[PDB]
Amino acid sequence: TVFHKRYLKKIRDLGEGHFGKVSLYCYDPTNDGTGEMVAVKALKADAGPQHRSGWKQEIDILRTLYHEHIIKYKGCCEDAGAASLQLVMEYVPLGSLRDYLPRHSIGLAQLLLFAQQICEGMAYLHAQHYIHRNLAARNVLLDNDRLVKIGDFGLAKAVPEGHEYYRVREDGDSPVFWYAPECLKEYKFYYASDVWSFGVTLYELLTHCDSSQSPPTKFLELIGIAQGQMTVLRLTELLERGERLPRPDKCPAEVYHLMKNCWETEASFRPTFENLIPILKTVHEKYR
Numbered sequence: 001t002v003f004h005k006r007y008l009k010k011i012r013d014l015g016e017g018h019f020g021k022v023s024l025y026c027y028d029p030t031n032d033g034t035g036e037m038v039a040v041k042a043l044k045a046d047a048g049p050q051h052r053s054g055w056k057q058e059i060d061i062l063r064t065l066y067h068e069h070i071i072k073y074k075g076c077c078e079d080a081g082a083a084s085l086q087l088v089m090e091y092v093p094l095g096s097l098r099d100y101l102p103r104h105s106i107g108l109a110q111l112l113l114f115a116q117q118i119c120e121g122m123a124y125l126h127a128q129h130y131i132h133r134n135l136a137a138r139n140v141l142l143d144n145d146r147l148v149k150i151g152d153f154g155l156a157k158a159v160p161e162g163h164e165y166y167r168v169r170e171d172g173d174s175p176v177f178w179y180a181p182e183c184l185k186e187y188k189f190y191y192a193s194d195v196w197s198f199g200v201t202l203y204e205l206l207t208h209c210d211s212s213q214s215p216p217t218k219f220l221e222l223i224g225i226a227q228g229q230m231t232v233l234r235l236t237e238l239l240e241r242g243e244r245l246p247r248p249d250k251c252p253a254e255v256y257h258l259m260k261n262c263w264e265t266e267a268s269f270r271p272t273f274e275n276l277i278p279i280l281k282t283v284h285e286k287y288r
């Protein structure tokens with residue numbers, strides 16, 4: 001599928017992804033303003049060959065994914081400037097849970113439904129042999145009060161069939177506060193590492209993405225802000241000691257224990273996304 005840049009009318013900027021900026025455009029070939037609203041992700045023109053090969057990998061990944069809880073790929077646009085492809089995706093109207101939750105008080109049952117849907121989309125992703133590596137409330141988009149979709153595949157990687165993990169690089173942009181200890185210490189990302197990040201995302205939802213309760217805020221309160229190059233080492237050490245993010249206010253005790261089970265230090269003790277689906281369905285039913 002191909003979109004022409006001459007019909008793309010920029011409305012506003014939506015934010016910054018991993019490889020570049022996301023903008024909202026009206027794709028209007030008739031010029032009558034009745035065209036579809038689309039989210040367009042672009043690679044910064046100044047980016048090097050490392051970001052360029054990774055950007056092409058992200059497009060390749062999103063083009064192959066098709067799920068009700070995964071942002072819909074619409075096509076690509078020939079960017080004459082930057083000499084690359086612009087990723088055309090569906091506009092998800094309510095935006096990210098990070099932006100939405102602080103301004104709209106959502107009930108516990110609805111948050112658990114969002115958690116269930118995240119697990120459904122993540123179970124499909126893992127079945128396709130991919131790891132997400134950036135599962136956070138910031139990357140979860142809300143279509144309506146009852147539908148959520150996973151976004152930003154900028155860190156997503158293919159896991160070979162014979163392998164259970166992918167070896168990661170020492171990176172400044174890594175979302176360390178959403179990462180399992182095996183990622184921080186051994187630079188290995190397992191399917192089970194995405195489950196750890198889900199536990200963190202669930203914590204975020206239960207706090208209504210309150211910035212004063214965010215994973216960086218809480219972990220840095222424990223680590224301190226004057227630790228030289230040792231923030232990650234101190235994070236690794238507290239996690240190994242069994243320290244964890246606290247129970248969000250009004251989060252049921254059993255839901256917090258499910259969260260802590262996503263945060264097992266031993267990756268094999270964590271549930272898979274497939275195990276989480278029937279559990280979250282039952283928990284959502286109890287609270288609805």
Ligand SMILES: O=C(Nc1ccnc(NC(=O)C2CC2)c1)c1c(Cl)cccc1Cl
Nearest residue numbers: 014015016022039091092094095151152
């Ligand atoms: O792709 C993103 N956001 C989208 C996509 C589609 N539609 C929307 N919709 C809106 O932003 C609505 C609120 C105006 C946002 C996005 C950005 Cl910009 C930064 C980090 C992570 C992610 Cl996933």
